[PDB]
Design a protein around this ligand. Sequence first.
Ligand SMILES: [Cl-]
Ligand SMILES: [Cl-]
Ligand SMILES: [Cl-]
Lengths: 275, 276, 275
Amino acid sequence: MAGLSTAELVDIALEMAEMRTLPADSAVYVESTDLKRVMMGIDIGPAELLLARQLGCDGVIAHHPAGGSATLNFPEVLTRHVELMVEHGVPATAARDAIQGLLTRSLLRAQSANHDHTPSVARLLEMPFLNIHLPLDEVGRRIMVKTIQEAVEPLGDEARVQDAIDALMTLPEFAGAATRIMVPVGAVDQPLGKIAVVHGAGTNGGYAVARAYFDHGVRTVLYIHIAPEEAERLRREGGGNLIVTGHIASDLVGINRYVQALEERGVEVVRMSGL
Amino acid sequence: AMAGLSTAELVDIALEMAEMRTLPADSAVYVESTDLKRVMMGIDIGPAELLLARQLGCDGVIAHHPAGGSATLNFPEVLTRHVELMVEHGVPATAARDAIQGLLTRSLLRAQSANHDHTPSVARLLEMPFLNIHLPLDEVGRRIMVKTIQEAVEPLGDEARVQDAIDALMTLPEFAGAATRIMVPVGAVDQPLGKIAVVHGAGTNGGYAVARAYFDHGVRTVLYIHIAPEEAERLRREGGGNLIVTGHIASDLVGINRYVQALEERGVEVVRMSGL
Amino acid sequence: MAGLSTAELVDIALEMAEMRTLPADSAVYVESTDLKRVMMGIDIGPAELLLARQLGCDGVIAHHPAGGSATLNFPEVLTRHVELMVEHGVPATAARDAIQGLLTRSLLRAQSANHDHTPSVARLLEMPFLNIHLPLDEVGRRIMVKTIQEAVEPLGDEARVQDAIDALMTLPEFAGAATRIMVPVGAVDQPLGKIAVVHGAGTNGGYAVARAYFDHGVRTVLYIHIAPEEAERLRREGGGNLIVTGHIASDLVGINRYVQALEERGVEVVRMSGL
Ligand SMILES: [Cl-]
Ligand SMILES: [Cl-]
Ligand SMILES: [Cl-]
């Protein structure tokens, strides 16, 4: 089996996410036409690129934006929070107002980054390099939604926060994780009501997105991570439940589907940085 | 000429020096070994430092700061030491638990969100023996600093000032030789010292809530190795006590340098970097 | 030609900046008398030093403090904020008060750093290494001031924020940047009034310094970067316009003039970490 191109490594991820084009938080920094053995990690910086070269890897795949147009255009993906809220019955105006804080600060952080820092190291090393973020989190989102829905839907109004956690614990990524699923707002024994799986929108929606879901009929919100001071502000105010599943464990759901699709295409994947 | 040390032996030297009976949760062996003769030790060790250790031909790496794995995961279990330290200076066990509750809740949330296997995955791919020793060495440094201050300020009684504690600490080579200086961000050097609590070896500094628990239960002077600048400003605005901030690296070196000398006596060569 | 010493690499920067002593945010970590091929980047840590060795570079130059006396003594350059405020008509006592919190917080952060971390790696690698920060930022500050003033002085009271931005967009660093110039406080259609280009004072002045300019006859303040929460706190109070030019594009104004002078002396500069 011939090695894959970076264009093919992107296509495999878009096919499974059902996306027609690479989203703004993902980029090819260094192209290649023949990758047989790649190193894949969630967080890749210059030290990990030097590591891949010492291991003799053909190229590197990262999950998190590593710079370039992925770090620069990252705030373009945030509008996906609006789609998820509207999907769950939050009014479009309420949903758009809720992300305005996160968007304003994400644009300022994007302008401030040293975008060419990790790509310049990849170019100097001649190391094929790309990050795939939103397509893999979208895959993860879909699995997590289907897993919870199939378990909580026959329960109806009897479903509790514990039942969505039990459903997520049927996934090997959560079952085998070193981390635990937490409930920083609300409790395990509280009614579930409607659940919103908020993942695959770039970053968690923090306080303001969870508040807008709680105020518009969605009692339980699920994030993969939350800022501690944002968890505390929501917890003291109450009005709903927050499930926080765990950054790495949650990312590995869509990432493991991808690694499997690469291996079937005959690419060897060297797992590291959380894989 | 002596045989190399195992990673188990490096842990046991630190626990014995610290007078501990169990390995604290903020210290872990990521990649084991039975024979280490030349090691690189640094306060902060990440993937770049492991790559360096391979370039230098080092047998193993000793970090001070948690580098992931169970050290980063279970770091919040060490924070209960802040309770025991507060209780020793007269804070009731419930008021001490109340004061650490916020740092404990946020630390649990921070421990869950880390990429625990990042630096350990690098050490395994490099097949580089690697471990971190945090709380045991901080506990060694805490006792040295308590004894130095107490031996200097106790004969002084009520005449002892904040300055007398600082002069005592300046007789330690880590502080006498430090590039940084000991600071007093709350209170002043000319204030009465009263009772002092050395709040080192409990994982991280206590911040605002812990310093306030000590100030409210008859401990006029609190000592940290570091403080968040916003936590210092909140304490300074309220007043009613002195805070001594000794300097992160220089304070970590008090316990670390005793450990390094014990390894060198067991014939282990230590390559010093990242603050050592 | 012939290779340059670390002392001559520093002198070229101080001559350009029209300075007579070395700013405390700039230091030579590992000396040398003969550097013919150097690597230069805005951010240089241990991984970048390992890269320089793989590429066979003679030395490394950083922009940002990389430890040692540069990180330790960085707060000393913040007095430059007071000199710029006083030069734009801000009363000396108000200028001194405006920088007090940033100074107090910078002294605490300086005491907390692992100063010998990156310098210890440079020494173990025997890699000549230095950082040049304030001198290059001062060259960039002067170029930006001259560019803006030439464009807006003929407009007088009719000059707008847009006119200062249009002037900056004649510089190749801003015209070619991946980032855009932003106006987080006020707007491009607002009167410019007096402008203060606040660059070359170590770091931006945040809320407290921009408030002091606004309250003392300087309607427009320019920073290369601002903390997002600081921009939001300034925006809620209004008072004037804030132009935020972009960290890397602005740092490159002084850095490109410096590189040009090294190349004229025959030194090869390997650009990376933003250059
Ligand atoms: Cl997140
Ligand atoms: Cl600390
Ligand atoms: Cl800045």
